[PDB]
Amino acid sequence: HSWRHIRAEGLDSSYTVLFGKAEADEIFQELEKEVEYFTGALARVQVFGKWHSVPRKQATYGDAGLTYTFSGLTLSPKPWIPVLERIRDHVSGVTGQTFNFVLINRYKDGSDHICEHRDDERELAPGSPIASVSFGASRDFVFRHKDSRPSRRVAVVRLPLAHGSLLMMNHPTNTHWYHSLPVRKKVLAPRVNLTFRKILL
DNA sequence: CTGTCTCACTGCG
DNA sequence: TCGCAGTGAGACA
């Protein structure tokens, strides 16, 4: 109910803290114990003509039959597990939005990262928001306008994403802005991030 | 003078 | 330690 609003041209996002420390810690410990991450062939992506192992771990859970493809990699959902349904249900309650798929990214420390991109794949429902819930170490998240990488002097938006927090990325954020989690060498602890999405069957 | 796009890396500064 | 430029091998429209 108290949201920090993050707005610029084409940028509509909202940030809030959902869980206090003790609850967040408990959810984190459960995610650590319960989440199974893809390995090997399901952990390699193709970008700029080259194949790379992803510098983090990824997992996908969601309703049966759906798929999510990005960067030459196709991920299939594992069935929902209790800790994930709990988070999904809490997020639906607070936002009034629904989700049928989640991508989980785990950054073991500040050297694990994710390069900039847009979540704009064809199989995301038009106009649907992405809910980004974070546990573990706080890490800086960066929004960058697509015509500044240059054409326009539009400033980056930076914010720390804290333990137990929710970042709502609403349309049209993903049409107009790239996001990333840059390397932060001083961060030593892991971070687990869940991005709940609505996927087209 | 003039196509768009890249969930990743190295090579700088 | 951080952030930026240029990819790179295509696949498009």
Curated annotation (Swiss-Prot):
The keyword Zinc-finger does not apply. Residues 98-200 form the Fe2OG dioxygenase domain. Its cofactor is Fe(2+). It comes from the Eukaryota. Detected in colon, small intestine, ovary, testis, prostate, skeletal muscle, heart, liver and urinary bladder. This is DNA oxidative demethylase ALKBH2. It is found in: Nucleus; Nucleus, Nucleolus; Nucleus, Nucleoplasm. The PCNA-binding motif (AlkB homolog 2 PCNA-interacting motif, APIM), mediates the colocalization of ALKBH2 with PCNA at the replication foci, coordinating the repair of alkylated DNA damage with DNA replication. 2-oxoglutarate binds at N105, Y107, H117, H179, R191, T195, R197. Interacts with PCNA homotrimer; this interaction is enhanced during the S-phase of the cell cycle. Interacts with nucleolar proteins NCL, UBTF and NPM1. Interacts with XRCC5-XRCC6 heterodimer. Its EC number is 1.14.11.33. Binds 1 Fe(2+) ion per subunit. Activated by ascorbate and magnesium ions. Changing R56A: Loss of activity toward N1-methyladenine adduct in either ssDNA or dsDNA. One of its GO terms (cellular component) is nucleus. Changing S71A: Strong decrease of activity toward N1-methyladenine adduct in ssDNA. Has no effect on lesion repair in dsDNA. Substrate binds at F48, G49, K50, Y68, T69, F70, D120. One of its GO terms (molecular function) is broad specificity oxidative DNA demethylase activity. GO terms for biological process: DNA alkylation repair. The keyword Nucleus applies. It catalyses: a methylated nucleobase within DNA + 2-oxoglutarate + O2 = a nucleobase within DNA + formaldehyde + succinate + CO2; an N(1)-methyl-2'-deoxyadenosine in double-stranded DNA + 2-oxoglutarate + O2 = a 2'-deoxyadenosine in double-stranded DNA + formaldehyde + succinate + CO2 + H(+); an N(1)-methyl-2'-deoxyadenosine in single-stranded DNA + 2-oxoglutarate + O2 = a 2'-deoxyadenosine in single-stranded DNA + formaldehyde + succinate + CO2 + H(+); an N(3)-methyl-2'-deoxycytidine in double-stranded DNA + 2-oxoglutarate + O2 = a 2'-deoxycytidine in double-stranded DNA + formaldehyde + succinate + CO2 + H(+). It is an enzyme of class 1 (oxidoreductase). Belongs to the alkB family. Keywords: Dioxygenase, DNA damage, DNA repair, Iron, Magnesium, Metal-binding, Nucleus, Oxidoreductase. Coiled coil: none annotated. The gene is ALKBH2.
